[PDB]
Amino acid sequence: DPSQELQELANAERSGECYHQVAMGQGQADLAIQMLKECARNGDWLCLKNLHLVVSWLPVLEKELNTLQPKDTFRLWLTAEVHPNFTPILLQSSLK
Amino acid sequence: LEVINQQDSNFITALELAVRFGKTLIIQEMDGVEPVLYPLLRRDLVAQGPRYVVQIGDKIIDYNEEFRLFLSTRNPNPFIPPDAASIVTEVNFTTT
Amino acid sequence: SKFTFTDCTRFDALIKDVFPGIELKEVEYDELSAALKQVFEEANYEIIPNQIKKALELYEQLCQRMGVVIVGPSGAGKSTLWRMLRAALCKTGKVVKQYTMNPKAMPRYQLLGHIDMDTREWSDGVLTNSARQVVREPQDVSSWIICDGDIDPEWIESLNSVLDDNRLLTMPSGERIQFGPNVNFVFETHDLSCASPATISRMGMIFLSDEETDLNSLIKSWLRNQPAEYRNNLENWIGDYFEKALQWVLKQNDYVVETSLVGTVMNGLSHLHGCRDHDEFIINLIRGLGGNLNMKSRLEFTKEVFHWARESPPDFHKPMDTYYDSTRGRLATYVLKKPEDLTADDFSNGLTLPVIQTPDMQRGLDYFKPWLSSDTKQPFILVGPEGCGKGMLLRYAFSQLRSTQIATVHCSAQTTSRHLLQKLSQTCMVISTNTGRVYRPKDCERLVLYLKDINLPKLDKWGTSTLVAFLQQVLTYQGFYDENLEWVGLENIQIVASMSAGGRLGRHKLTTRFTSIVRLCSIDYPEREQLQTIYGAYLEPVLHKNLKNHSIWGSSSKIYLLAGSMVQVYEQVRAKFTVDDYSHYFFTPCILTQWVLGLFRYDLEGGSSNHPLDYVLEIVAYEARRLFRDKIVGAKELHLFDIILTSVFQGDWGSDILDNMSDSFYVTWGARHNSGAPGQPLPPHGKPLGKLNSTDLKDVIKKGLIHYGRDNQNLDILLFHEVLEYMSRIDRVLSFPGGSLLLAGRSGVGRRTITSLVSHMHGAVLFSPKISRGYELKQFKNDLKHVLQLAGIEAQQVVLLLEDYQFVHPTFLEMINSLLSSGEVPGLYTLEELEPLLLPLKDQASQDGFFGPVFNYFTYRIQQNLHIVLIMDSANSNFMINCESNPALHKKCQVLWMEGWSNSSMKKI
Amino acid sequence: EMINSLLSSGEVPGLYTLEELEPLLLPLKDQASQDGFFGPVFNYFTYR
Amino acid sequence: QGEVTIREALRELDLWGVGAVFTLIDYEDSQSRTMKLIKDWKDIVNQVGDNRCLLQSLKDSPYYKGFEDKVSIWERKLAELDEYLQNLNHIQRKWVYLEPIFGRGALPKEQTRFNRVDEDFRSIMTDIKKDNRVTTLTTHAGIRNSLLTILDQLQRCQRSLNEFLEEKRSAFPRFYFIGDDDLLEILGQSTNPSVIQSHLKKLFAGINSVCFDEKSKHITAMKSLEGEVVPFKNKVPLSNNVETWLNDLALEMKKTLEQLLKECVTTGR
Amino acid sequence: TDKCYLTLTQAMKMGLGGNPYGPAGTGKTESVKALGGLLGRQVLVFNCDEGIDVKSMGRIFVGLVKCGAWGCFDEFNRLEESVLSAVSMQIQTIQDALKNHRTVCELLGKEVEVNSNSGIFITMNPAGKGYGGRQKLPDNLKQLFRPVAMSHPDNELIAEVILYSEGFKDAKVLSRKLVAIFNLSRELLTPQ
Numbered sequence A: 001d002p003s004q005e006l007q008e009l010a011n012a013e014r015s016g017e018c019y020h021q022v023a024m025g026q027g028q029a030d031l032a033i034q035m036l037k038e039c040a041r042n043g044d045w046l047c048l049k050n051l052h053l054v055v056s057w058l059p060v061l062e063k064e065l066n067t068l069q070p071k072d073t074f075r076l077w078l079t080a081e082v083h084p085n086f087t088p089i090l091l092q093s094s095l096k
Numbered sequence B: 001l002e003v004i005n006q007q008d009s010n011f012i013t014a015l016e017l018a019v020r021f022g023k024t025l026i027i028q029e030m031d032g033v034e035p036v037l038y039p040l041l042r043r044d045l046v047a048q049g050p051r052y053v054v055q056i057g058d059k060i061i062d063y064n065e066e067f068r069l070f071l072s073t074r075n076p077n078p079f080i081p082p083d084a085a086s087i088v089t090e091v092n093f094t095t096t
Numbered sequence C: 001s002k003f004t005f006t007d008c009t010r011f012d013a014l015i016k017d018v019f020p021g022i023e024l025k026e027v028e029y030d031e032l033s034a035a036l037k038q039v040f041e042e043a044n045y046e047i048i049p050n051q052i053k054k055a056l057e058l059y060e061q062l063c064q065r066m067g068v069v070i071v072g073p074s075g076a077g078k079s080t081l082w083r084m085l086r087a088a089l090c091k092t093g094k095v096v097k098q099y100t101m102n103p104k105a106m107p108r109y110q111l112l113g114h115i116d117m118d119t120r121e122w123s124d125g126v127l128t129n130s131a132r133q134v135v136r137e138p139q140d141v142s143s144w145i146i147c148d149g150d151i152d153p154e155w156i157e158s159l160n161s162v163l164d165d166n167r168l169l170t171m172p173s174g175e176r177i178q179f180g181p182n183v184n185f186v187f188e189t190h191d192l193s194c195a196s197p198a199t200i201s202r203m204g205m206i207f208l209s210d211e212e213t214d215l216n217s218l219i220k221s222w223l224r225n226q227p228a229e230y231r232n233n234l235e236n237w238i239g240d241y242f243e244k245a246l247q248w249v250l251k252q253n254d255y256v257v258e259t260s261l262v263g264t265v266m267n268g269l270s271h272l273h274g275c276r277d278h279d280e281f282i283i284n285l286i287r288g289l290g291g292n293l294n295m296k297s298r299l300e301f302t303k304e305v306f307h308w309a310r311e312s313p314p315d316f317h318k319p320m321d322t323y324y325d326s327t328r329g330r331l332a333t334y335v336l337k338k339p340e341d342l343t344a345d346d347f348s349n350g351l352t353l354p355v356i357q358t359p360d361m362q363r364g365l366d367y368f369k370p371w372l373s374s375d376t377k378q379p380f381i382l383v384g385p386e387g388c389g390k391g392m393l394l395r396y397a398f399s400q401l402r403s404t405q406i407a408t409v410h411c412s413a414q415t416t417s418r419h420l421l422q423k424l425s426q427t428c429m430v431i432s433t434n435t436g437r438v439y440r441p442k443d444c445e446r447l448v449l450y451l452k453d454i455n456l457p458k459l460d461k462w463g464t465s466t467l468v469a470f471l472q473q474v475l476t477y478q479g480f481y482d483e484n485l486e487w488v489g490l491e492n493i494q495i496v497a498s499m500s501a502g503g504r505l506g507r508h509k510l511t512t513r514f515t516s517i518v519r520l521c522s523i524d525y526p527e528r529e530q531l532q533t534i535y536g537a538y539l540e541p542v543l544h545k546n547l548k549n550h551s552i553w554g555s556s557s558k559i560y561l562l563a564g565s566m567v568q569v570y571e572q573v574r575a576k577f578t579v580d581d582y583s584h585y586f587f588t589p590c591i592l593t594q595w596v597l598g599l600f601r602y603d604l605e606g607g608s609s610n611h612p613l614d615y616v617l618e619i620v621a622y623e624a625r626r627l628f629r630d631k632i633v634g635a636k637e638l639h640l641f642d643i644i645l646t647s648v649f650q651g652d653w654g655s656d657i658l659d660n661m662s663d664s665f666y667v668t669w670g671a672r673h674n675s676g677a678p679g680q681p682l683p684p685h686g687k688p689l690g691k692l693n694s695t696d697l698k699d700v701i702k703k704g705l706i707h708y709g710r711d712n713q714n715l716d717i718l719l720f721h722e723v724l725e726y727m728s729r730i731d732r733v734l735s736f737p738g739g740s741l742l743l744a745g746r747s748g749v750g751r752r753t754i755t756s757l758v759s760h761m762h763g764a765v766l767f768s769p770k771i772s773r774g775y776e777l778k779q780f781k782n783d784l785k786h787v788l789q790l791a792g793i794e795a796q797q798v799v800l801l802l803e804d805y806q807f808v809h810p811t812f813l814e815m816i817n818s819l820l821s822s823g824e825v826p827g828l829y830t831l832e833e834l835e836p837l838l839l840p841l842k843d844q845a846s847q848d849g850f851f852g853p854v855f856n857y858f859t860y861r862i863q864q865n866l867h868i869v870l871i872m873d874s875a876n877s878n879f880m881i882n883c884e885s886n887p888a889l890h891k892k893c894q895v896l897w898m899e900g901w902s903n904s905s906m907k908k909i
Numbered sequence D: 001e002m003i004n005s006l007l008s009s010g011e012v013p014g015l016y017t018l019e020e021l022e023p024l025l026l027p028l029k030d031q032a033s034q035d036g037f038f039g040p041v042f043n044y045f046t047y048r
Numbered sequence E: 001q002g003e004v005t006i007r008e009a010l011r012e013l014d015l016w017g018v019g020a021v022f023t024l025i026d027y028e029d030s031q032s033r034t035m036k037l038i039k040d041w042k043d044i045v046n047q048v049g050d051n052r053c054l055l056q057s058l059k060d061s062p063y064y065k066g067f068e069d070k071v072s073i074w075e076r077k078l079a080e081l082d083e084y085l086q087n088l089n090h091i092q093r094k095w096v097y098l099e100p101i102f103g104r105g106a107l108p109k110e111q112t113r114f115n116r117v118d119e120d121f122r123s124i125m126t127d128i129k130k131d132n133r134v135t136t137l138t139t140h141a142g143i144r145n146s147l148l149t150i151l152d153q154l155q156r157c158q159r160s161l162n163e164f165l166e167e168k169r170s171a172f173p174r175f176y177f178i179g180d181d182d183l184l185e186i187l188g189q190s191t192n193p194s195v196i197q198s199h200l201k202k203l204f205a206g207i208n209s210v211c212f213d214e215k216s217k218h219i220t221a222m223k224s225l226e227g228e229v230v231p232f233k234n235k236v237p238l239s240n241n242v243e244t245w246l247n248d249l250a251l252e253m254k255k256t257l258e259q260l261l262k263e264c265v266t267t268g269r
Numbered sequence F: 001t002d003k004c005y006l007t008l009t010q011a012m013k014m015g016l017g018g019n020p021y022g023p024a025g026t027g028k029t030e031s032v033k034a035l036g037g038l039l040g041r042q043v044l045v046f047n048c049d050e051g052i053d054v055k056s057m058g059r060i061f062v063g064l065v066k067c068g069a070w071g072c073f074d075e076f077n078r079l080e081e082s083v084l085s086a087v088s089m090q091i092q093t094i095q096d097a098l099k100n101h102r103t104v105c106e107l108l109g110k111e112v113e114v115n116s117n118s119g120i121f122i123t124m125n126p127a128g129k130g131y132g133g134r135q136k137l138p139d140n141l142k143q144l145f146r147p148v149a150m151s152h153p154d155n156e157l158i159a160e161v162i163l164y165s166e167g168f169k170d171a172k173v174l175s176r177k178l179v180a181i182f183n184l185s186r187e188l189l190t191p192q
């Protein structure tokens, strides 16, 4: 479980509760994109989780990663599981 | 010249203008072979006196003789079937 | 309650070992058993003490816990138990109010209820409604919600909170409905292979066996239902012939569809009532039992039955065909009945072909005749290998009837409840009697739903089709829960379904619940000595509608010899090819029928008296070539097929008859009397054909190509031998009434180019849906409504064209599969949109002689006036799946194998 | 005369048949039920 | 020669076909009106079921072929009368439910709807007040579409009431497990004791039923499944605003158990 | 029940849920209601099936945090898989609001008032060899609870205390007789 370390890191390095997080499930994707754009503009962080279930969503995610114009101190944190048929393009443009 | 993105809001309208005015067209973020672009990639030219028209969806559109179409791709796989690859010649920029 | 016999005895031996002398004491009460034996006495059953023990046992369990399973095989008396304990308790006890669900037939969201997704509006369900109706009732009631159906965990675990120590039913909205101390759930079932042990530990249980059943105790009540004019002889013959013939069949166990004991008994019995004498009763017993075996065992079944009878018939060779007559007392002579009514007017419809009454067709009719009469309302199912003669013979037996109304429905891998419901509700009245609304056939007496395929619908991931569960509900309870929350009965409906033997893939097996309720038998392939006679008596009149009075043709030994040669060809081709090679090496005698009805198309006039052997034999060889040959993939197999064909034609007459007519092209474009475009209704055998040349066809192609390039894209089409071949083969199939093609080939080669040209040269309208961004299925439905309207109202000859890039949603192949196979598209039109559209067809319906409603005439016009073209790429990945998952997609349309130009022509380009 | 009728009343007389009104006015019963307009469906169609 | 049996059964059904009437009962709503509402439905419906199964018993007689034509009459007659009664009881229950809610908080876009339904129901019930013979509903002036349209308009005013239901569910917390069907009863029938004893069980799981005082203005005790009875330490004033005495039930139950525990432990130590 | 009570009370002290599990037919479902009986709460036993909406679970959660009742979400295993994922965020929000002693939580837009004497539990089986179609729970969502083993109950102690409570006097002999009958009959007779 990485979530507690991320929470403690967000409490340490930042203050005022800038940390925002959304899990991926039935009916959360279209607000996930809105929160992605809004926290890209604000410069605050964003933690998506469980990107191994929504496998036919990730082309929209990589399109929006290619398109957006972020600010400084923005940090996008992902969390996925080992899964065949994954998409290479965001695997290219990420640490692992 | 006009250059357009794949997941773009004004795709078919700008495609109609590029077929009519005789532009040279470049498409950015192609994820494969679109369903729309099959008779235009083939030769489907019904004559109206001296000119020729070509089918794009529902409209009937004049095929200008200055029509040149290029399109880019960001991932070697996706996407060709074995039907839209015997008409489209494929070029792979690669680091060697 | 749980035990068998011997395990209960060993459990008693264990109870003795833990407690030394405190062994036994029995059931305390008996005054309910008096009422129970009274109710058995009322309903004319028998009285068996075992049923009494089980019913008292059930009352004990129902007082004890909340839910009871009644495990048992098919037909072995597990529903009559609660069915009679109902009345036996209700004569003294308060009120037993029965609600009967069947949980697999209807979908889940109607059964347990569900929510409208966008509105947030709770739709009620069936047993939520039943739960409200029981918790309305006052304290002096009792109710038994009964789920007479099979068991899957993903719905039966939804009742864990009901069958709990707690007593509560919950809605997904949060609404929670309790239950008092009254209610019981009774779950009649088949087995518990697929239930998790939470439910198995959660509810009570009753076991039944195949040792407790008494066969004689069911023979006696059937004998008591006999009209006292034959019962002496029937009991005297049953009591010493029945048990031997039953136990020998249970010893062999080579029976083709699996039934229980009760099913074998009823199949033995329902071919008997009305026997006169001993020798007739033997044959009725044989036709009762041996229908479920196969031919390796039926023969020695007949041998042992006749040998352990009185005597042997004169049918000592092939004893399957003994014809007992009441008139003389004759036992057996198999006689062939030849018709002599033979013109070309019989063959006008593609269906209603003249049935040649061979002895096997007489055996089939002698099987059918006792069950389709108006005294025995029996549902039954034929078994046959695919393409053998089932539908033709059953339509003949439909035509022998009196006041029926046939309604054939072709089922497939998508057929559900609503499709048969609308096929019923188009031709059936709605009259509102007492005890709920009901359906009754209009203007007839015995409506017959003829279900075409039963193996073919789709299992879920446990093994239970909703279709067969629905038909089980209908054939057991004569009704169904229609939606909008109301039971709806049926009144006068048979179900006579068909199937093939479960050999190939896509053929599921049937449950034993549905099998042992209804009747069945099987039939075999018409063999070679039969098929020579069938196609000799087909080949004589279609020839002798012309040149009947000439030299060699006539004196029908030669007509028989040609048919025998073609049968030899068909047999050796089936000997050298299989279905393990590819998806579509299809070989039934449907091919021989289409083959020998192809010969109407040719100018066989012979007034200019030829050789004349070669002039007709080359015609025969070309038709055989373009039927058999053009579906063989590998080149070496093509050469082997050539060796076969030539070896046949030389073994029949000498040598060198096929020699050199490879340059011939029998095309529409040129024949006798100037084939030559008006004439929009089609001939009954298509436009006639004639001999041509290569270069002359080249000029005809160039003329039509100029005229095409006038109003289209100007085409730079080259010419080589293979394009001439391909355009000839497309013409000689698109000039057939109701023809379609599957074009399997590489990409890049011209296929849509040649078919567009032939569609312009025959004046047929060509149509292909032009895809856009927002592809849907609604789009495709509107385009199919357009094409079906034009082709089925305005009598216009239409060519429909679908290619690979347009199948953008995975139900399109299924719609095209249906529209190929039947002639309809199911669930396409509503009911209100058929009368203002088919209203201008009643006039021609009146004048033409076609009867029934207007919709069958509309479907017949679509079957005559619509052509489908499928271009599919060979080495696509999904080609094997989409040739295996739609079986009519290689049974309806001829499949040309276009792949690969020659080495010779790529040099010439 | 047709324009005179279609101005004055709201209908065109002798235009539709009887069979071609129920599969066409069939999607109007719902708003007919919700709006409060009574009588048959054809008066609601004429009013629209 | 058992034709006299079938004739005897038909004379029995004819003797039934003149007698049965209703039980016209004066009922008054919130604002002062008076309509003859109809009770004792099961007494009427069970006779109909007996008559239909009796006709089915007559359908098994071998002499049915000469008397089928009268059986057709009584078949269609009972088939109409059953559906008419089984609709009119729905209409009666839903009208009794939906009178006080639209009476108290009148929003006119709801009011025009429910006034048209009110007119269409009270016009039928006046003609029933005129003639109360039970086969007059078979012979009124086309009541079938009147009944179906009244049912449909009540369904639509339910769909309008969804928003107010969610308001009261956010008001009192326990209501998320009551359906709508009982919640609007408890909102409307704010004084009826039969409603309270029929639906207070599903709200608080402990209380099986309650008592009432001598004027049905206070609740003084509560019961159990086996009949364990605990009195309350103070009477509970019933009123119209339903949360303003359900809150009193919750507080007074907790205070009663709290003081009863103290009294028990105080004597026990 | 010693094991069960101590695990659930420590899990409530840490501000988390409680997930007892094990094979079928033990007593895990009624143990939660027994704890609610001994504590003085009210228990609203549910069922979780069919894959209902995350808003439909959300309104249930709103009811539970406003009233103050223990949702004993029986069969939390068999539920649609992404619904579990969104429910994980919901439960985490509620448990944060509990642990920080918050009076006003916020899910589905509104400011729902959460109650201090609240609580959430589930019960489930492991998706073993014959427990039908059940989907495996997410790892994140498992990290919110506190698992309890409830595998084997006793059989002599319950059977002797019940018979001694029900007026019968000779419980200490006959209870052992019952349990030995169960064990031998399960052990040697043919396994149907």
Ligand SMILES: Nc1ncnc2c1ncn2[C@@H]1O[C@H](COP(=O)(O)OP(=O)(O)OP(=O)(O)O)[C@@H](O)[C@H]1O
Pocket (backbone or CB within 6 Å): C045, C046, C047, C048, C051, C072, C073, C074, C075, C076, C077, C078, C079, C080, C081, C217, C218, C221, C513, C517
């Ligand atoms: N006492 C009896 N004497 C003679 N026959 C009986 C008796 N009781 C039942 N039967 C016969 O047993 C047959 C099957 O009864 P029942 O429907 O209970 O079996 P089943 O196993 O429930 O059927 P299914 O396999 O459809 O569930 C009936 O046709 C009935 O005639």
Ligand SMILES: Nc1ncnc2c1ncn2[C@@H]1O[C@H](COP(=O)(O)OP(=O)(O)O)[C@@H](O)[C@H]1O
Pocket (backbone or CB within 6 Å): C353, C355, C356, C358, C361, C385, C386, C387, C388, C389, C390, C391, C392, C526, C534, C589, C590, C593
């Ligand atoms: N005894 C026969 N005489 C002539 N033709 C026959 C005979 N038996 C079968 N056929 C041919 O075989 C075909 C059988 O079709 P059928 O088996 O009904 O199709 P399906 O298997 O799809 O129901 C018929 O069209 C008929 O031409």
Ligand SMILES: Nc1ncnc2c1ncn2[C@@H]1O[C@H](COP(=O)(O)OP(=O)(O)O)[C@@H](O)[C@H]1O
Pocket (backbone or CB within 6 Å): B042, B043, C716, C717, C718, C719, C723, C746, C747, C748, C749, C750, C751, C752, C753, C754, C871
């Ligand atoms: N025999 C031929 N001679 C000349 N050109 C041909 C021939 N066959 C195909 N073509 C070329 O192929 C193109 C059409 O291909 P098409 O029919 O669309 O392939 P497919 O049938 O696989 O979709 C035309 O432009 C035509 O020039």
Ligand SMILES: Nc1ncnc2c1ncn2[C@@H]1O[C@H](COP(=O)(O)OP(=O)(O)O)[C@@H](O)[C@H]1O
Pocket (backbone or CB within 6 Å): C165, F023, F024, F025, F026, F027, F028, F029, F030, F031, F158
């Ligand atoms: N400690 C106990 N004392 C008495 N009865 C018990 C006990 N534990 C369980 N039971 C009984 O076992 C039955 C099932 O318990 P439950 O919690 O439903 O287990 P499961 O959920 O595994 O079926 C209940 O009827 C309950 O009364």
Ligand SMILES: [Mg+2]
Pocket (backbone or CB within 6 Å): C078, C079, C080, C188
């Ligand atoms: Mg049964």
